Design a protein around this ligand. Sequence first.
Ligand SMILES: O[C@@H]1[C@@H](O)[C@H](O[C@@H]2CO[C@@H](O[C@@H]3CO[C@@H](O[C@@H]4CO[C@@H](O)[C@H](O)[C@H]4O)[C@H](O)[C@H]3O)[C@H](O)[C@H]2O)OC[C@H]1O
Ligand SMILES: O[C@@H]1[C@@H](O)[C@H](O[C@@H]2CO[C@@H](O[C@@H]3CO[C@@H](O[C@@H]4CO[C@@H](O)[C@H](O)[C@H]4O)[C@H](O)[C@H]3O)[C@H](O)[C@H]2O)OC[C@H]1O
Length: 507
Amino acid sequence: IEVDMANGWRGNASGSTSHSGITYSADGVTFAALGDGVGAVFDIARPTTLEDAVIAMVVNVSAEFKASEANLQIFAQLKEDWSKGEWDCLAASSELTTDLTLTCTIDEDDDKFNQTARDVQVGIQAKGTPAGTITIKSVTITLAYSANVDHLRDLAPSDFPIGVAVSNTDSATYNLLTNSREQAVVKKHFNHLTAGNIMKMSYMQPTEGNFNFTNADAFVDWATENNMTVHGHALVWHSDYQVPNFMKNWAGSAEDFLAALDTHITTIVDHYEAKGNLVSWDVVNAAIDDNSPANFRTTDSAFYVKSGNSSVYIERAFQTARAADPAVILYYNDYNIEQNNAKTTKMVDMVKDFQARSIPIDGVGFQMHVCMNYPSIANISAAMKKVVDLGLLVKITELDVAVNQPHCDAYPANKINPLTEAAQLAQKKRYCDVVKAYLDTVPVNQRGGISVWGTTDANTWLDGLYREQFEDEKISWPLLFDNNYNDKPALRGFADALIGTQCTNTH
Ligand SMILES: O[C@@H]1[C@@H](O)[C@H](O[C@@H]2CO[C@@H](O[C@@H]3CO[C@@H](O[C@@H]4CO[C@@H](O)[C@H](O)[C@H]4O)[C@H](O)[C@H]3O)[C@H](O)[C@H]2O)OC[C@H]1O
Ligand SMILES: O[C@@H]1[C@@H](O)[C@H](O[C@@H]2CO[C@@H](O[C@@H]3CO[C@@H](O[C@@H]4CO[C@@H](O)[C@H](O)[C@H]4O)[C@H](O)[C@H]3O)[C@H](O)[C@H]2O)OC[C@H]1O
């Protein structure tokens, strides 16, 4: 709460000496400190949840007030219940001179400031034998749950990994290796990791024949130290920000381009085989378009264009990855293929073609970037079953569940902001439904794992993707842990599914 400094302020006398009101300017709110108990205040409407809230004021006091040796008391009290309040803050003349920052934590014995009955009067007053003036420049007021899950990974009903995507050197704030809160949540709940960006193409090979393994190797070493396996992401992907410059600008033949693509794959696969912890790769990521009917991408993919207007690079990537390490599990990975419409159909036809022509492929990764109420559990189940029936592994690679999403629930007509308890419980049921559909649809020996695309809501990729539609607000809140790394009901819902407990949006 940033308190308005231009409206809503009042003089106050909490003692016998009368006050002389308040004065507005460009510097803030000013009053004369006429006697003991004389101050300035504003109101907060009922109901209030103000226990453990922190009041911070920037103030500025006159020479005469300094000379008076008077103290300053930040306080709050209930209107019509005047005797009840927070009276234990005091800034003594000692500490005063400049704009100072004075704070007051609202901390009461009986929880009196979590209440429904009265409005709340908040302010600052002089104590002692005061004189001169006080100026307040600004006021800010900084206002748990447990899922009771000890280790999420330990609840899987068969042997499949429970995994998470982490940030690395691509984020100063959220880098797994420098952020001890990220390390803690990961070590507590997961046994499987994906790098969010640093194993993508231009990160691994920024120029032709100069590979850069240093940062990704430190990530793999930390996974090994902590008894976790690594899913490699990704050997081939069209997204412009991570295509190596020399590939974007290829000026030679189609056969020479495909040979350079082979070198990229063989070098990276051989290196991570020898490092000793790399169990599966997304070999080709998101190569099908978003049209209906669906086709492989054309002009928006450097790989289609530089291969000579051909999708042959897809099968070649799989053949090359297999030759480099025959033991590593090979996935095709994509979004929207869980919807059971045009894109699902194109993916299934591609797998059938590959099986007919002896092109190696071990599984399909369903990224599973879903909305709260779309697509349906029936459609998600039917789409995964199409892959199960071809004898392949099914892996959920990038699960998140958006509370607001511009393509769902007629956004923004029903926008949820701020986040509510009802929305958190809806998210609990939704994570339960999706994980249960996976277990119900995919036989034990075809379960490639379930991973979520991030740790805390404070760093989800969705808020950046939809920044324009969201008006720069962080409103997708799509993951298992909140902005302070505490549990959300979402985590209880994931756990309920693993243990076979009914999926609900209740407590
Ligand atoms: O250290 C604590 C003491 O400060 C504390 O004294 C209390 C201070 O607050 C007092 O409440 C006064 C009551 O008058 C209010 O103004 C009235 C608002 O309504 C108008 O209709 C009316 O005309 C005004 O006069 C004022 O806002 C408010 O500060 C309270 O009565 C004192 O008990 O005691 C506890 C110590 O720990
Ligand atoms: O020089 C800096 C640039 O490098 C930097 O680039 C940004 C890097 O982050 C990018 O966002 C990435 C995009 O990929 C996300 O994961 C994908 C989600 O969709 C799935 O289909 C796919 O499989 C996943 O790989 C990832 O979470 C997210 O962090 C962003 O788009 C780039 O612009 O910009 C800052 C410069 O200083």
